[PDB]
Design an enzyme around this catalytic site. Structure first.
Site, PDB file in Angstrom:
ATOM      1  N   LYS A 122      18.128  10.707 -14.780  1.00  0.00           N
ATOM      2  CA  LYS A 122      19.145  11.102 -14.242  1.00  0.00           C
ATOM      3  C   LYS A 122      20.556  10.380 -14.447  1.00  0.00           C
ATOM      4  O   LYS A 122      21.614  11.245 -14.722  1.00  0.00           O
ATOM      5  CB  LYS A 122      18.871  11.072 -12.766  1.00  0.00           C
ATOM      6  CG  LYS A 122      18.304  12.420 -12.011  1.00  0.00           C
ATOM      7  CD  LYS A 122      16.751  12.299 -12.451  1.00  0.00           C
ATOM      8  CE  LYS A 122      15.937  13.426 -11.773  1.00  0.00           C
ATOM      9  NZ  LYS A 122      14.625  13.640 -12.211  1.00  0.00           N
ATOM     10  N   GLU A 206      24.967   8.827  -4.973  1.00  0.00           N
ATOM     11  CA  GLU A 206      26.155   9.715  -5.298  1.00  0.00           C
ATOM     12  C   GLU A 206      26.388  10.482  -3.830  1.00  0.00           C
ATOM     13  O   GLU A 206      25.597  10.620  -2.749  1.00  0.00           O
ATOM     14  CB  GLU A 206      25.891  10.834  -6.226  1.00  0.00           C
ATOM     15  CG  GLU A 206      24.537  11.762  -6.131  1.00  0.00           C
ATOM     16  CD  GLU A 206      24.325  12.752  -6.951  1.00  0.00           C
ATOM     17  OE1 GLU A 206      25.180  12.644  -7.867  1.00  0.00           O
ATOM     18  OE2 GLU A 206      23.519  13.529  -6.987  1.00  0.00           O
ATOM     19  N   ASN A 241      12.864  20.685  -0.314  1.00  0.00           N
ATOM     20  CA  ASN A 241      13.501  20.810  -1.616  1.00  0.00           C
ATOM     21  C   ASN A 241      12.703  21.390  -2.779  1.00  0.00           C
ATOM     22  O   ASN A 241      12.681  21.005  -3.862  1.00  0.00           O
ATOM     23  CB  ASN A 241      14.217  19.342  -2.040  1.00  0.00           C
ATOM     24  CG  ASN A 241      14.678  18.680  -0.978  1.00  0.00           C
ATOM     25  OD1 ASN A 241      15.695  18.687  -0.324  1.00  0.00           O
ATOM     26  ND2 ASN A 241      13.797  17.129  -0.773  1.00  0.00           N
ATOM     27  N   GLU A 281      21.603  23.671 -12.779  1.00  0.00           N
ATOM     28  CA  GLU A 281      21.743  23.762 -11.422  1.00  0.00           C
ATOM     29  C   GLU A 281      22.878  23.211 -11.115  1.00  0.00           C
ATOM     30  O   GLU A 281      23.466  22.276 -11.519  1.00  0.00           O
ATOM     31  CB  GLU A 281      20.557  23.078 -10.837  1.00  0.00           C
ATOM     32  CG  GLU A 281      19.215  23.628 -11.402  1.00  0.00           C
ATOM     33  CD  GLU A 281      18.025  22.919 -10.508  1.00  0.00           C
ATOM     34  OE1 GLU A 281      18.434  22.280  -9.536  1.00  0.00           O
ATOM     35  OE2 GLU A 281      16.985  23.191 -10.913  1.00  0.00           O
ATOM     36  N   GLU A 294      21.040  19.120 -12.338  1.00  0.00           N
ATOM     37  CA  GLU A 294      20.037  18.951 -13.319  1.00  0.00           C
ATOM     38  C   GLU A 294      20.034  20.146 -14.376  1.00  0.00           C
ATOM     39  O   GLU A 294      20.351  21.115 -13.805  1.00  0.00           O
ATOM     40  CB  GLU A 294      18.851  18.656 -12.579  1.00  0.00           C
ATOM     41  CG  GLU A 294      17.514  18.379 -13.536  1.00  0.00           C
ATOM     42  CD  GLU A 294      16.209  18.248 -12.697  1.00  0.00           C
ATOM     43  OE1 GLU A 294      16.568  18.246 -11.582  1.00  0.00           O
ATOM     44  OE2 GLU A 294      15.276  17.702 -13.234  1.00  0.00           O
ATOM     45  N   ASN A 296      17.393  21.903 -16.334  1.00  0.00           N
ATOM     46  CA  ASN A 296      16.060  21.827 -16.687  1.00  0.00           C
ATOM     47  C   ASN A 296      15.631  22.411 -18.078  1.00  0.00           C
ATOM     48  O   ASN A 296      16.148  23.443 -18.436  1.00  0.00           O
ATOM     49  CB  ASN A 296      15.345  22.801 -15.629  1.00  0.00           C
ATOM     50  CG  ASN A 296      13.906  22.784 -15.630  1.00  0.00           C
ATOM     51  OD1 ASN A 296      13.315  23.982 -15.878  1.00  0.00           O
ATOM     52  ND2 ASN A 296      13.198  21.839 -15.095  1.00  0.00           N
ATOM     53  N   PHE A 354       6.474  24.151   7.928  1.00  0.00           N
ATOM     54  CA  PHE A 354       6.880  25.116   7.188  1.00  0.00           C
ATOM     55  C   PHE A 354       6.078  25.390   5.783  1.00  0.00           C
ATOM     56  O   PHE A 354       6.708  25.648   4.769  1.00  0.00           O
ATOM     57  CB  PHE A 354       8.452  24.659   6.566  1.00  0.00           C
ATOM     58  CG  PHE A 354       9.370  25.166   7.862  1.00  0.00           C
ATOM     59  CD1 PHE A 354       9.043  25.261   9.202  1.00  0.00           C
ATOM     60  CD2 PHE A 354      10.753  25.418   7.542  1.00  0.00           C
ATOM     61  CE1 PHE A 354       9.899  25.324  10.187  1.00  0.00           C
ATOM     62  CE2 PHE A 354      11.540  25.755   8.317  1.00  0.00           C
ATOM     63  CZ  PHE A 354      11.379  25.809   9.757  1.00  0.00           C
TER      64      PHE A 354
HETATM   65  N1  LIG Z   1      24.143  15.344  -4.413  1.00  0.00           N
HETATM   66  C1  LIG Z   1      23.354  16.494  -3.868  1.00  0.00           C
HETATM   67  N2  LIG Z   1      23.837  16.763  -2.453  1.00  0.00           N
HETATM   68  C2  LIG Z   1      23.490  17.665  -1.628  1.00  0.00           C
HETATM   69  N3  LIG Z   1      22.230  18.001  -1.957  1.00  0.00           N
HETATM   70  C3  LIG Z   1      21.613  17.675  -2.953  1.00  0.00           C
HETATM   71  C4  LIG Z   1      22.129  16.674  -4.094  1.00  0.00           C
HETATM   72  N4  LIG Z   1      20.961  16.632  -5.030  1.00  0.00           N
HETATM   73  C5  LIG Z   1      20.187  17.131  -4.610  1.00  0.00           C
HETATM   74  N5  LIG Z   1      20.163  18.144  -3.464  1.00  0.00           N
HETATM   75  C6  LIG Z   1      19.411  18.878  -2.773  1.00  0.00           C
HETATM   76  O1  LIG Z   1      18.100  18.583  -3.262  1.00  0.00           O
HETATM   77  C7  LIG Z   1      17.383  19.875  -3.812  1.00  0.00           C
HETATM   78  C8  LIG Z   1      16.418  19.458  -4.793  1.00  0.00           C
HETATM   79  O2  LIG Z   1      17.207  18.478  -5.925  1.00  0.00           O
HETATM   80  P1  LIG Z   1      16.484  18.352  -7.348  1.00  0.00           P
HETATM   81  O3  LIG Z   1      16.774  19.350  -8.161  1.00  0.00           O
HETATM   82  O4  LIG Z   1      17.392  17.281  -8.053  1.00  0.00           O
HETATM   83  O5  LIG Z   1      15.057  18.056  -7.134  1.00  0.00           O
HETATM   84  P2  LIG Z   1      13.971  17.965  -8.143  1.00  0.00           P
HETATM   85  O6  LIG Z   1      12.607  17.700  -7.387  1.00  0.00           O
HETATM   86  O7  LIG Z   1      14.201  16.902  -9.403  1.00  0.00           O
HETATM   87  O8  LIG Z   1      13.636  19.433  -8.849  1.00  0.00           O
HETATM   88  P3  LIG Z   1      13.384  20.224 -10.183  1.00  0.00           P
HETATM   89  O9  LIG Z   1      12.310  20.961  -9.906  1.00  0.00           O
HETATM   90  O10 LIG Z   1      14.698  21.072 -10.594  1.00  0.00           O
HETATM   91  O11 LIG Z   1      13.342  18.961 -11.153  1.00  0.00           O
HETATM   92  C9  LIG Z   1      18.760  20.513  -4.327  1.00  0.00           C
HETATM   93  O12 LIG Z   1      18.181  21.884  -4.359  1.00  0.00           O
HETATM   94  C10 LIG Z   1      19.624  20.352  -3.169  1.00  0.00           C
HETATM   95  O13 LIG Z   1      19.423  21.183  -2.083  1.00  0.00           O
HETATM   96 MG   LIG Z   2      15.698  19.326  -9.640  1.00  0.00          MG
END
Ligand SMILES: Nc1ncnc2c1ncn2[C@@H]1O[C@H](COP(=O)(O)OP(=O)(O)OP(=O)(O)O)[C@@H](O)[C@H]1O
Ligand SMILES: [Mg+2]
Ligand SMILES: CCC(=O)SCCNC(=O)CCNC(=O)[C@H](O)C(C)(C)COP(=O)(O)OP(=O)(O)OC[C@H]1O[C@@H](n2cnc3c(N)ncnc32)[C@H](O)[C@@H]1OP(=O)(O)O
Ligand SMILES: *C(=O)CCCC[C@@H]1SC[C@@H]2NC(=O)N[C@@H]21
EC number: 6.4.1.3
Lengths: 673, 247, 261
Positions: A122, A206, A241, A281, A294, A296, A354
């Site tokens: 990240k 962050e 998420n 995203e 991110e 993807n 949920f």
């Molecule tokens: N800095 C942020 N501020 C607010 N919400 C955030 C932030 N970072 C992440 N989120 C929330 O977390 C959710 C998932 O984050 P993220 O995409 O990093 O997760 P992931 O499990 O790595 O996903 P992916 O399957 O896309 O790799 C986002 O859709 C958002 O709602």
């Molecule tokens: Mg993600």
């Protein structure tokens, strides 16, 4: 779909489920021999039978069957494969797979290893985006190593501070914090959970954007340094998420923002030298300020919806790019065509948390392919069982139309016309989300499910008119069943005298209330008086079809009858929600008033061995909380193991027997609560 | 409810290995009309399933072995439970449908002391007496005397089908190998050659003991058809006041 | 010189001696008569008419095609005869040949005599001594059992059926005596159980012997399967004749009325 151009003759798909089926279909459309991998359990899945040939990879678990690189290598070696498509997940991000795969002549259909390693972590992605002069979340640069550093940085980076474990993903390792004490305690907790789950131990801290919209841009890079942004998508509806309901044309976003975000994504892709399909995203706030989250580096799961607004087969373009051909489309050629909304149908109980994963076997499965403007992607066929080894997801349902309202209406119709029997699914959640007033209006954020249903998912609160419609439909169904029961073939020895009852006076108990219903039948028309209100129900009254279409006061409704007992209980799916109604006659209700309540305590705390035999294994120990359906002690008896289960949800008080023990019939084996 | 309805969900209900189990009631629900089944004695002698259902609107009696409970073995209680149901269905012109998955009879001193012979004879007699149409489907296993106790063709059965997972054998492949190749004592190849020719429904098929090896998904579509033809079945037997049930 | 007559004589002399001479010596050492001796004791002297004397098994698996595995009669002696002047059909299982285990020919002979008996309306008496079912032949053997069983159910209430257990009987050869009207056993030499003691030890884990698992005392005192038990074969056959004098030949006939003093 021009077959004149030369393309890879053999492609192996290193995935399973809906994505394998989609890749097989798009490869068959372009004349390519296909190879499908499968474990022993999935030996009869849809993608195996749709593929030209298949190669077993190993045992049931994914860590030993689809994540085993050596089995994939030998399968490619034997089958003379020329290309490989990882779909999404699994080894799509595996650098080791990429290197051992490029060791030979076979090529990996996807982005280069450089982009994979750049975006896997990240903080490096964030610093690259900062070097990419694109808008990003204001946050600490680097990795925080101590709680004191976390709090001192949190002093300036903002009170609503989000801590995210570096690398990993899947919705885990992310948590919001408010206070400095919250900062430090979340820091330590994130530390041990990242050590346990991810093992990276690196944490990215962050600012948390409040009430954001999770917009996503689909980019299609090639080998000639060209990047094209295919409009946008919205994945605001999220659960833990994890996205469930998505819409390709975002209403909140406008043309200028679309162009700006597309240009930013193209610049970032060119900076990273992406040469395949991917997505970026962003979190758009109220004031249309987006920030990189991110990018993807694989075929994103929600890809089909944007196809419905573009018309480009993303997998086909990925294959053509992997061949080396230049992109056949220009940025000006990309446009928005109609509207598209899609929902992921999982095998989970939406009433609990949920959506919590469930297991079972699908006794009935039918999709609404006959309905207009509906696309279904699924690796599911009748008889397919949902296991714990893989993602408990059933299908993906996409609707496209001229505008948003038509797409939502078609989505509602498709969900009402979707037959799944054998497991518990989240169709009610999706239908209530699509028919929600806020969702139709356009006010959606990432907290939609949380704020709309604060106390949890409860079901479709039906109004007075809807309640009357449901009661009339249930009463009409009851009377139709009675009338069908009255129909016998001619005997000619004892002729049947059909009763001439004209009015049926029924008592219908729903939830907790009781209603008096007067039903009259004239051919296929049912005049139903519920508490004075008069309604007319008309339908073919086919009592065997899983889906029943009726017309109440002109309004056409589609209902299902999932259960029916002679006692009067009936489970009916109406407007996506399953309601339990107890229907009796007036005389039966008056006589039932006298019946006493039966207290049901039971024991369910003593386990009996069906026969003498040797207990092959025991998976429980005294103090284990178990529920119904879980095997307690599997007993091997005469070349057959019985997985005996607990009768009720109770903690295991004692396991008298042990592994490798011989017992007789009806011996003391397990005592529960 | 159409009589030609397909049941693809039964195409993989039988587990690959004989060690695992499955629920026969799922098969019964998938086959019968509108999945409505009235089970008789659902909580007693649960290793056998008996009940009333409908096929094409005609009342039928369902009998089957339950692999979940007691490995599908036959014992005294299950034999007595099945025999009287079969006798009642035969006495009132009701067709019988049987689903066979049975490893054998439950052994032990308790079963012999209780008179397992008499009650197994009860069940065998009940199936042999029936003059109503009877249709049998073998799902996984039919070993030993339990093969022909559970409404075989040789008891004047009408139509018998076998699923592709059927296993018809005189007795277990191993024990057969040691009792046949006792001097050979080379089970390494003896079992391998035995499981290649006899661990499959082909022997009974080539002897004509089963009518056809059908796909599971056509099961209902077959049975209904048979029940439409066998509705006119009439057989003649020697006169007697009454027979001697082994009660 | 015609070899047909000498072949006929050799096959006859092989049938009368069953599956060997040392096997007959072993059978007599255990205190057990041979099948033909039992038939001679049961029937009136000079009244036995044998059927299917030369019938042979047709299995050709696991070396059963070799002449060393080819015995005329095939471990069963079937025919008809008279007891006190009344007709009766009889079969006796020869333990000498392959342990008396059932095959296609064995079941065919038994079914033939049962069909003849139900045709004319005469009782059937069966002397059971069978180690089991020939497993080399395979599934066909089961068919044999089932065929026999069917005829039992068809003959129930039509002609009397009597079974005398004179040796070990396991597996599926326990249901034919159960389906018949009366069952008698010989003490200390007869056994009736579905599964042997070794299988019981393997599955239920309890060590028992043959005598306490399927012996005459077990099935006559605490099982309710057998009706009477006799000391030896001679006494058993004498009592069988005495019992046979009571019954009518068929359900069409009335109860037998004798001369009384
Ligand atoms: N800095 C942020 N501020 C607010 N919400 C955030 C932030 N970072 C992440 N989120 C929330 O977390 C959710 C998932 O984050 P993220 O995409 O990093 O997760 P992931 O499990 O790595 O996903 P992916 O399957 O896309 O790799 C986002 O859709 C958002 O709602
Ligand atoms: Mg993600
Ligand atoms: C899975 C584990 C298994 O396979 S156990 C179940 C099948 N295995 C068997 O051995 C069952 C057959 N063996 C038996 O002993 C019989 O059950 C009974 C009825 C108990 C015979 O008792 P007994 O008088 O002691 O016989 P025995 O062992 O002394 O041998 C004498 C001859 O009898 C024969 N015999 C007997 N049954 C069969 C049979 N089913 N098929 C073929 N032959 C049989 C034996 O071959 C034996 O022959 P021989 O005289 O030793 O040459
Ligand atoms: C598998 O191990 C089954 C062993 C039980 C033997 C069963 S019991 C009834 C049948 N008769 C026989 O001799 N074997 C069969």
């Amino acid at each position: 779909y021009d077959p004149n151009e030369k393309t890879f003759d053999k492609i192996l798909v290193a995935n399973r489920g809906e994505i394998a089926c989609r890749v097989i279909r798009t490869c068959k459309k372009m004349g390519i021999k296909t190879v499908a991998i499968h474990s022993d359990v999935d030996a009869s899945s849809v993608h195996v039978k749709m593929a030209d040939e298949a190669v077993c990879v190993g045992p049931a678990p994914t860590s030993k069957s689809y994540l085993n690189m050596d089995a994939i290598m030998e399968a490619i070696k034997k089958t003379r494969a020329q290309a490989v498509h990882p779909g999404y997940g699994f080894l799509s991000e595996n650098k080791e797979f990429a290197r051992c795969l490029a060791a030979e002549d076979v090529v990996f259909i996807g982005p280069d290893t450089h982009a994979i390693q750049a975006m896997g972590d990240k903080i490096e992605s964030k610093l690259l985006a900062k070097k990419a002069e694109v808008n990003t979340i204001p946050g600490f640069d680097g990795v925080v190593k101590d709680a004191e550093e976390a709090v001192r940085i949190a002093r300036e980076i903002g009170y609503p501070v989000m801590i995210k474990a570096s690398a990993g993903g899947g919705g885990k390792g992310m948590r919001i914090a408010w206070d400095d004490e919250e900062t430090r305690d979340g820091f330590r907790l994130s530390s041990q959970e990242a050590a346990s789950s991810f093992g990276d131990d690196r944490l990215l801290i962050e600012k948390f954007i409040d009430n954001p919209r999770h917009i996503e841009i689909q980019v299609l890079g090639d080998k000639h340094g060209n990047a094209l942004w295919l409009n946008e998508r919205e994945c605001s509806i999220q659960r833990r998420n994890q996205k469930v309901v998505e819409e390709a044309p975002s209403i909140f976003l406008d043309a200028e923002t679309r162009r700006a975000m597309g240009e930013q994504a193209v610049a970032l892709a060119r900076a990273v030298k992406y040469s395949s399909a991917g997505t970026v995203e962003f979190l758009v706030d109220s004031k249309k300020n987006f920030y990189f989250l991110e990018m993807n580096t694989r075929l994103q799961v929600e890809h089909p919806v944007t196809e419905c607004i573009t018309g480009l087969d993303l997998v086909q373009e990925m294959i053509r790019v992997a061949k080396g051909y230049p992109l056949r489309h220009k940025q000006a050629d990309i446009r928005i065509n109609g509207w598209a909304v899609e929902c992921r149908v999982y095998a989970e109980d939406p009433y609990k948390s949920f959506g919590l994963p469930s297991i079972g076997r699908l006794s009935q499965y039918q999709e609404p392919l006959h309905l207009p403007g509906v696309r279904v992607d699924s690796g599911i066929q009748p008889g397919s069982d949902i296991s714990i080894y893989y993602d408990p997801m059933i299908s993906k349902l996409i609707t496209y139309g001229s505008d948003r309202t038509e797409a939502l209406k078609r989505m509602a119709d498709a969900l009402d016309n979707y037959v799944i029997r054998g497991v518990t699914h989240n169709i009610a959640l999706l239908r209530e989300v699509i028919i929600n007033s806020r969702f139709v209006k356009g006010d959606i954020s990432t907290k939609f499910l949380s704020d709309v249903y604060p106390d949890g998912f409860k079901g479709h609160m039906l109004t007075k008119s809807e309640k009357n419609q449901l009661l009339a439909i249930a009463s009409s169904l009851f009377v139709a069943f009675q009338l069908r029961a009255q129909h016998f073939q001619e005997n000619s020895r004892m002729p049947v005298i059909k009763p001439d009852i004209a009015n049926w006076e029924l008592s219908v108990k729903l939830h907790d209330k009781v209603h008096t219903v007067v039903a009259s039948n004239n051919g296929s028309v049912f005049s139903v008086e519920v508490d004075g209100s008069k309604l007319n129900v008309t339908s073919t009254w086919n009592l065997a079809s899983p889906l029943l279409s009726v017309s109440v006061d002109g309004t056409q409704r589609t209902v299902q009858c999932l259960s029916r007992e002679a006692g009067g209980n009936m489970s009916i799916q109406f407007l996506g929600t399953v309601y339990k109604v107890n229907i009796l006659t007036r005389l039966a209700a008056e006589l039932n008033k006298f019946m006493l309540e039966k207290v049901t305590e039971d024991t369910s705390s003593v386990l009996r061995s069906p026969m003498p035999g040797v207990v092959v294994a025991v998976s429980v120990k005294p103090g284990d909380a178990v529920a119904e359906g879980q095997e307690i002690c599997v007993i091997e008896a005469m070349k057959m193991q019985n997985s005996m289960t607990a009768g009720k949800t109770g903690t295991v008080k004692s396991v008298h027997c042990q592994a490798g023990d011989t017992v007789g019939e009806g011996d003391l084996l397990v005592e529960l609560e | 409810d159409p009589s030609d309805r397909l049941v693809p969900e039964l195409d993989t209900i039988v587990p690959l290995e004989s060690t695992k189990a499955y629920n026969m009631v799922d098969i019964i629900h998938s086959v019968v009309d509108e999945r409505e089944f009235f089970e008789i004695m659902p909580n007693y002698a649960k290793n056998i399933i008996v009940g009333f259902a409908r096929m094409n609107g005609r009342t039928v009696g369902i009998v089957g072995n339950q692999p979940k409970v007691a490995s599908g073995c036959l014992d005294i209680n299950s034999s007595v439970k099945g025999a009287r149901f079969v006798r009642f269905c035969d006495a009132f012109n009701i067709p019988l449908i049987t689903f066979v998955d049975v490893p054998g009879f439950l052994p032990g001193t308790a079963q012999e002391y209780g008179g397992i012979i008499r009650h197994g004879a009860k069940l065998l007699y009940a199936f042999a007496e029936a003059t109503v149409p009877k249709v049998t489907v073998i799902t996984r296993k039919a070993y030993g005397g339990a093969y022909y106790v559970m409404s075989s063709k040789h008891l004047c059965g009408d139509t018998n089908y076998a699923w592709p997972t059927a296993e018809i054998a005189v007795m277990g492949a191993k024990g057969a190998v040691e009792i046949i190749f006792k001097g050979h004592e080379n089970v390494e190849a003896a079992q391998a050659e035995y499981i290649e020719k006899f661990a499959n429904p082909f022997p009974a098929a080539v002897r004509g003991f089963v009518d056809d090896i059908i796909q599971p998904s056509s099961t209902r579509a077959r049975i209904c058809c048979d029940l439409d033809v066998l509705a006119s079945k009439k057989v003649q037997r020697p006169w007697r006041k009454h027979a001697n049930i082994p009660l | 010189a015609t070899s047909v007559n000498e072949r006929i004589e050799n096959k006859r002399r092989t049938a009368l001696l069953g599956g060997g001479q040392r096997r007959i010596d072993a059978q007599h050492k255990r205190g057990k008569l041979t099948a033909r001796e039992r038939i001679s004791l049961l029937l009136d002297p000079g009244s036995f008419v044998e059927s299917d004397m030369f019938v042979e098994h047709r299995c050709a698996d696991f070396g059963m095609a070799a002449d060393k595995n080819k015995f005329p009669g095939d471990s069963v002696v079937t025919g008809r005869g008279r007891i006190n002047g009344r007709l009766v059909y009889v079969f006796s299982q020869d333990f000498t040949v392959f342990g008396g285990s059932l095959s296609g020919a064995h079941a065919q002979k038994i079914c033939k005599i049962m069909d003849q008996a139900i045709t004319v309306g005469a009782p059937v008496i069966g002397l059971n001594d069978s180690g089991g079912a020939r497993i080399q032949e395979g599934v066909e053997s089961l068919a044999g059992y089932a065929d026999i069983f069917l005829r039992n159910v068809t003959a129930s209430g039509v002609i009397p059926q009597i079974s005398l257990i004179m040796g070990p009987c396991a597996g599926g050869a326990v249901y034919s005596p159960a389906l018949t009207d009366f069952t008698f056993m010989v003490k200390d030499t007869s056994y009736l159980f579905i599964t042997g003691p070794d299988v019981v030890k393997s599955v239920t884990n309890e060590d028992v012997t043959q005598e306490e698992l399927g012996g005459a005392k077990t099935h006559t005192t605490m099982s309710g399967v057998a009706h009477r038990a006799f000391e030896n074969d001679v006494d058993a056959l004498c009592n069988l004749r005495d019992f046979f004098n009571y019954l009518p030949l068929s359900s069409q006939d009335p109860a037998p009325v004798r001369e009384c003093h």
